[PDB]
Amino acid sequence: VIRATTWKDLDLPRLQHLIQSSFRRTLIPHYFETTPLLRAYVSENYRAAVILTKLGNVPYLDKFAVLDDAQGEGLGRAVWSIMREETPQLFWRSRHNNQANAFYYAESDGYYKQDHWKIFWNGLHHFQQIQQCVAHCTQHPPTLID
Amino acid sequence: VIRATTWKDLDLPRLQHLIQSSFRRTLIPHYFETTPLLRAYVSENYRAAVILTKLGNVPYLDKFAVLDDAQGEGLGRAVWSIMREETPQLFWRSRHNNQANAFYYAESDGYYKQDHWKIFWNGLHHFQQIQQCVAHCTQHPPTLID
Numbered sequence: 392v393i394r395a396t397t398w399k400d401l402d403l404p405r406l407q408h409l410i411q412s413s414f415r416r417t418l419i420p421h422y423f424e425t426t427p428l429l430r431a432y433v434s435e436n437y438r439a440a441v442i443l444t445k446l447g448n449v450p451y452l453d454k455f456a457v458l459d460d461a462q463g464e465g466l467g468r469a470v471w472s473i474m475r476e477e478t479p480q481l482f483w484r485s486r487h488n489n490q491a492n493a494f495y496y497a498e499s500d501g502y503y504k505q506d507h508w509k510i511f512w513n514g515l516h517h518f519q520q521i522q523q524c525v526a527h528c529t530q531h532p533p534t535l536i537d
Numbered sequence: 538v539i540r541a542t543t544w545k546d547l548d549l550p551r552l553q554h555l556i557q558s559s560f561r562r563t564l565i566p567h568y569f570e571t572t573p574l575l576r577a578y579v580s581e582n583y584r585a586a587v588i589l590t591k592l593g594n595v596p597y598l599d600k601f602a603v604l605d606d607a608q609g610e611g612l613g614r615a616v617w618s619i620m621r622e623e624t625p626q627l628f629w630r631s632r633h634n635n636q637a638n639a640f641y642y643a644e645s646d647g648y649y650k651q652d653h654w655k656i657f658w659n660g661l662h663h664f665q666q667i668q669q670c671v672a673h674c675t676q677h678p679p680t681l682i683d
């Protein structure tokens with residue numbers, strides 16, 4: 392698994408293709424130029440990725456991109472596990488119909504159901520911070536388009 | 538479905554057998570005499586039950602007991618549905634053991650994992666409330682043993 396702390400250390404066209412293939416949508420123009428990277432974890436052959444970004448006090452998991460054909464080998468789970476070794480606190484959002492939600496239910500320490508989004512987190516013991524994470528997920532503009 | 542607001546309106550030995558059979562554990566001595574019933578929903582054949590009790594300000598789902606046998610999933614869902622029609626707000630807890638966890642993940646509006654409990658809620662819209670409900674669950678003695 393490739394660990395990067397700058398976009399310069401990744402193959403960005405290949406990462407864009409992974410994201411677009413996984414989500415079956417288009418990545419917004421200038422995504423890499425406008426997104427403050429914290430850490431990314433990308434499988435060697437760009438079949439699964441976890442992208443952490445700066446969004447408030449708690450690390451934000453902005454993208455969990457896993458190709459449908461990488462699930463038999465458990466590649467997305469393996470990349471997630473690598474991220475978690477370094478990341479005791481994090482939060483993220485998910486569509487209500489995301490096939491990954493069963494995995495998220497198992498992996499998360501908490502959940503809050505909102506209109507658009509399921510909001511998940513790990514490692515947060517302060518409910519003011521949890522409330523703020525929920526607000527960030529609701530407020531943060533989308534980076535997938537058509 | 539039988540709806541009861543007092544333990545005297547239920548067959549308690551039969552209910553104890555349902556609870557102990559569903560959980561495959563023992564119900565603590567004089568559970569019924571020391572548990573402040575809010576209301577109970579019991580299927581006619583005593584193969585499924587939802588027990589709401591008095592714990593803080595929000596209805597507390599103290600036992601969801603459902604036999605694995607003859608459409609247990611269908612029956613448990615039916616009883617839960619009836620309870621929810623009458624119960625906009627509630628909270629409850631579960632062990633990672635508990636068979637109903639997938640159902641809880643799907644039915645709840647949120648959860649929070651703490652000290653080997655998963656704490657779930659519906660209809661709570663103040664993190665003030667949520668935190669207090671988490672506190673109640675973590676403090677509340679176990680009533681299943683061995």
Ligand SMILES: CC(=O)N[C@@H](CCC(=O)O)C(=O)O
Pocket residue numbers: 452453454455456483484485486534535
């Ligand atoms: C964790 C993760 O992949 N979040 C994605 C979900 C996007 C979507 O489903 O539309 C995000 O951009 O926030």
Ligand SMILES: CC(=O)N[C@@H](CCC(=O)O)C(=O)O
Pocket residue numbers: 598599600601602629630631632634635680681
């Ligand atoms: C919702 C419900 O049945 N809670 C039960 C069982 C918890 C458990 O051990 O899983 C309780 O006594 O709190």
Ligand SMILES: [Cl-]
Pocket residue numbers: 457461462463464465466467468469
């Ligand atoms: Cl996977």
